[PDB]
Structure 1
Amino acid sequence: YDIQAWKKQCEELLNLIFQCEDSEPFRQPVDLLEYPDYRDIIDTPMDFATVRETLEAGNYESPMELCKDVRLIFSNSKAYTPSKRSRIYSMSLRLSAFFEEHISSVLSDYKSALRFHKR
């Protein structure tokens, strides 16, 4: 019932995501010189360094907010991909499955802790 425990759990999950080779295309903002039409398709860029920095700044109130930004990394890859078989998109799908598998307990524990606080 620890309402604050999510933050360190998210830090540890981001550390695992940065060790995963599948995260390399997503660790820093998409390079606009490499992909010059990126912002014609993607309204809200997001990357794992921005997520980590937002967490470390104390600018997430809940793990739901962090989860929304990570999911945006993956939806941006899906929107920008020219093919559902492309390398970078393919990496995004594996990383998404790994993230969802690990975040589910973080979210459940947080929401249970808040319900207990409010009982």
Structure 2
Amino acid sequence: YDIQAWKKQCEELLNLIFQCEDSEPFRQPVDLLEYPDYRDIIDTPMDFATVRETLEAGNYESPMELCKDVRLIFSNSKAYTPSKRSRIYSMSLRLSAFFEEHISSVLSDYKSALRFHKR
């Protein structure tokens, strides 16, 4: 029933993601010098350092907001990929499955804690 517990849970999940080799293309913003057309395709860049910094700044109110930004990292990779078999996109799919597997309980616990608070 702890309404604040999601924050440390998200910090720990981000630490695991940064240890994962599959996160390396997503740890910092996409390099616009190496992918010069990136902003012609992607409206809202997102990366894991931006997510971590937003969390540490106290600029997420809920784990749902964090989850929306993490999902944007994956949807950007899918939208920019030239192929569904591309290396970076394939890494995003594995990392997304890992993220979804771990965020599920964080979201469930937060929503149940909030329902208890408003009972």
Provide TM-score, normalisation by structure 2: 1.00
Q: How much does 1:77 deviate?
A: 0.1
In 2, Cα distance between equivalents of 1:64 and 1:34: 32
Q: How much does 1:65 deviate?
A: 0.0
Which residue of 2 is the match for residue 103 of structure 1? 103
Q: How much does 1:47 deviate?
A: 0.0
Q: How much does 1:44 deviate?
A: 0.1
Which residue of 1 is the match for residue 50 of structure 2? 50
Unmatched 5+ stretches in structure 2: none
- The SS at the match of 1:2 is coil
- The SS at the match of 2:50 is helix
Task: Give the paired residue count.
Answer: 119
Per-residue CA distance 1:52-107 (angstroms, 9 max, x = gap): 00000000000000000000000000000000000000000000000000000000
In 2, Cα distance between equivalents of 1:90 and 1:8: 28
Unmatched 5+ stretches in structure 1: none
Which residue of 2 is the match for residue 80 of structure 1? 80
Q: Percent identity?
A: 100
Per-residue CA distance 1:10-42 (angstroms, 9 max, x = gap): 000000000000000000000000000000000
Q: How much does 1:45 deviate?
A: 0.1
In 1, Cα distance between equivalents of 2:50 and 2:35: 19
